[PDB]
Amino acid sequence: MVDQAVLDKLEAGYQKLQASADCHSLLKKYLTRQVLDACKNRKTQMGATLLDVVQSGFENLDSGVGLYAPDAESYTLFKELFDPVIDDYHKGFKPTDKHPPTDFGDVNTLCNVDPDNQFVISTRVRCGRSLQGYPFNPCLTEAQYKEMEDKVKGQLNSFEGELKGTYYPLLGMDKATQQQLIDDHFLFKEGDRFLQAANACRYWPVGRGIFHNDNKTFLIWCNEEDHLRIISMQKGGDLKQVFSRLINGVNHIEKKLPFSRDDRLGFLTFCPTNLGTTIRASVHIKLPKLAADRKKLEEIAGKYNLQVRGTGGVYDISNKRRMGLTEYQAVKEMQDGILELIKIEKSM
Numbered sequence: 001m002v003d004q005a006v007l008d009k010l011e012a013g014y015q016k017l018q019a020s021a022d023c024h025s026l027l028k029k030y031l032t033r034q035v036l037d038a039c040k041n042r043k044t045q046m047g048a049t050l051l052d053v054v055q056s057g058f059e060n061l062d063s064g065v066g067l068y069a070p071d072a073e074s075y076t077l078f079k080e081l082f083d084p085v086i087d088d089y090h091k092g093f094k095p096t097d098k099h100p101p102t103d104f105g106d107v108n109t110l111c112n113v114d115p116d117n118q119f120v121i122s123t124r125v126r127c128g129r130s131l132q133g134y135p136f137n138p139c140l141t142e143a144q145y146k147e148m149e150d151k152v153k154g155q156l157n158s159f160e161g162e163l164k165g166t167y168y169p170l171l172g173m174d175k176a177t178q179q180q181l182i183d184d185h186f187l188f189k190e191g192d193r194f195l196q197a198a199n200a201c202r203y204w205p206v207g208r209g210i211f212h213n214d215n216k217t218f219l220i221w222c223n224e225e226d227h228l229r230i231i232s233m234q235k236g237g238d239l240k241q242v243f244s245r246l247i248n249g250v251n252h253i254e255k256k257l258p259f260s261r262d263d264r265l266g267f268l269t270f271c272p273t274n275l276g277t278t279i280r281a282s283v284h285i286k287l288p289k290l291a292a293d294r295k296k297l298e299e300i301a302g303k304y305n306l307q308v309r310g311t312g313g314v315y316d317i318s319n320k321r322r323m324g325l326t327e328y329q330a331v332k333e334m335q336d337g338i339l340e341l342i343k344i345e346k347s348m
Helices: 004-019 026-030 033-039 051-059 079-089 142-156 175-183 193-197 239-256 288-293 296-304 327-345
Strands: 120-129 165-169 209-213 218-222 228-235 280-286 306-309 314-319
Touching: 004 026, 004 033, 004 051, 026 051, 026 079, 033 079, 051 079, 051 193, 120 239, 120 327, 142 165, 142 209, 142 218, 142 239, 218 239, 228 239, 239 327, 280 327, 288 296, 288 327, 296 306, 296 327, 306 327, 314 327
Parallel strands: none
Antiparallel strands: 120 228, 120 280, 165 209, 209 218, 218 228, 280 314, 306 314
């Protein structure tokens, strides 16, 4: 069933990993002889093989993780590789652990993290979705890209009120439209070497597109890394408003387009780092006092399970956790973490 040439490529790629002393990917750590022999002869119903999982980490020895999901089934079919990788990356999510049911919870318990607008430049909540019944980017055909786009465009064009907007296909996009989207920080392009070597950017840009609302507070990407990337954002710290809008947008889409969700892993994504809630809730925030040290900060951020990115003293701070907690719990801890960071700058 699995081509001998494919088995040969798996064998050569395993050997490549072993011969590289600098390679420290999760792929190399967990694709043992035993796991490789257990998995190599399997194929999903949509036709994905272990190569469609691991090929990017063979090509990019400096990968962090080094593997992706070619479709929903792959997560369970290749569990002897995916399970240890997930456990490692999500910092304790064991093979027997189970993600909770979806729960966006009660938005009226959320607030503005900076009502006086002294610290937070902007607030963003992002999630990701795969559409049930389609392969992920490594195995989508050109036909499936086109058919999926038509379905997506249908549902996005039916947004009403605050979410009403325009869909912009990448195919045939004119230079002036492109410049406007760049100006709004809404454009995406063909993927980096990790995505290319994962077969995630084929038939570019067929079936790829960008949607945003008239107010430019809601943004969807179609067939960048996942089928859908859905983002709510605005100036200031009103996390309640941002998250409310996200829920409304995701919920609209779902009325016609069912999502891929696993009972154990939550929402399924091309990248294993994005499972569970798929949520990254972030702020762009200035904390000049704490910023000085950059350790007392790191130590406090980690204490509220936050992660500090950095794109003067403007930082991007977000929830670190994706799996093992609800959507509500992820957003609420980010909220509590930021309220505590602000409350301590006021004392520094």
